[PDB]
């Protein structure tokens with residue numbers, strides 16, 4: 001058997017734009033994901049978050065599912081433009097009311113809320129003012145965070161400033177694959193820097209407003225292996241993984257190989273901001289899904305090498321040992337006081353069998369192998385306090401639309417019916433047992 005520590009927090013995770021629908025209901029302003037997905041060509045099949053899982057209406061049923069599964073924590077995000085429709089200034093009470101009901105319901109049911117302040121649905125109004133490219137976003141984000149803290153901090157005691165700032169910056173502003181859909185490397189590195197500044201101002205406000213809670217930040221991470229006999233791997237870790245942000249937070253500068261590649265793209269006097277960026281955080285959240293084989297390639301000087309390994313429906317190679325590696329590595333590099341795995345999961349081509357069930361043994365195998373590796377890191381002294389499955393529900397998978405199903409609960413979009421998958425049942429047992437067997 002593999003038993004986890006007493007009080008270990010087993011959770012599931014979602015994000016507002018991916019599940020809620022009703023993006024313009026009750027006075028909400030448009031987000032950049034609304035306008036991006038409504039632009040032809042940006043999302044597969046022309047899919048948008050207009051309806052999604054209809055969680056905006058079905059939230060109580062969904063939380064009742066979390067409760068019934070015995071899951072102990074729910075990580076969800078708040079839509080900024082539901083709360084401040086123009087990004088700054090006016091606060092929308094109906095937007096606050098929506099999350100107030102979710103929070104109170106979770107608490108009544110003994111489920112711990114983990115709130116992600118920003119999971120990519122920037123107010124459109126702020127994008128018109130340059131969004132993450134504008135230094136003033138540190139102020140806008142601080143003001144938004146303060147509203148959340150003032151309204152919810154009496155009840156929510158666990159906060160995440162940003163989901164995956166690497167993705168927000170690079171995928172949104174260099175690759176142009178995510179909102180706001182830009183391709184400018186100078187803008188992308190300014191977004192990196194402002195994401196750190198905004199995160200730090202929000203932590204600063206947190207210390208002044210919620211003297212009894214904890215706050216951290218969440219990073220995407222992959223397990224990069226060299227295609228042979230190495231520095232391309234060092235570069236990928238430093239750039240794509242937690243070091244891009246934790247080196248500033250803990251050490252007051254970007255990682256060495258990031259500075260090699262990208263110095264010319266950062267603001268000239270970026271070091272001036274580093275003392276403020278070191279604002280103390282309470283925990284680090286690591287997301288982890290996939291591994292990659294990496295070679296130097298003269299034509300970021302880096303390319304991936306395809307491996308004959310099992311893959312998910314995303315085409316992502318399944319490499320469970322990567323979750324152990326990333327957990328050991330974060331301890332070794334920055335020794336954060338607490339770590340959470342804030343996302344782990346997989347997309348597979350789920351179908352409802354004639355028996356009414358969704359037999360996703362593939363997802364069970366995936367989760368089991370990763371949970372086992374996380375257990376290993378704990379035995380070796382990593383202060384892992386919780387693990388969150390992405391996702392509770394099949395949902396809007398960004399530029400892939402509804403074509404990729406990550407839920408432990410199946411959503412039939414024609415009816416909005418939820419069907420707990422075999423993986424959901426399996427996970428509920430893991431949680432009940434506080435581990436594997």
Ligand SMILES: OC[C@@H]1[C@@H](O)[C@H](O)[C@@H](O)c2nnnn21
Pocket residue numbers: 015018163164220287289343390397406
């Ligand atoms: O792509 C699947 C999921 C997304 O749905 C989440 O929104 C995002 O936080 C993430 N990071 N890595 N994998 N994911």
